[PDB]
Amino acid sequence: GSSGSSGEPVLCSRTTCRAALNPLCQVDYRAKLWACNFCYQRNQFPPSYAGISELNQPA
Numbered sequence: 001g002s003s004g005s006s007g008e009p010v011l012c013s014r015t016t017c018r019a020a021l022n023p024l025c026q027v028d029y030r031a032k033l034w035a036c037n038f039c040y041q042r043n044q045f046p047p048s049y050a051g052i053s054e055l056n057q058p059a
């Protein structure tokens, strides 16, 4: 990705949580949502959810 999309990490909304995107949390790709496994908070997906390499290849 030389001179390309840098991409930024997606940290949970909650400050105390700020848990990175892990395969443990319930990612509702259908409802464009993802529930946390710790704070258990529903966060909406970002407008630029492209760069994110993790997302690109959903496990």
Ligand SMILES: [Zn+2]
Binding pocket: 012, 013, 014, 017, 018, 019, 036, 037, 038, 039, 040, 041
């Ligand atoms: Zn959380």
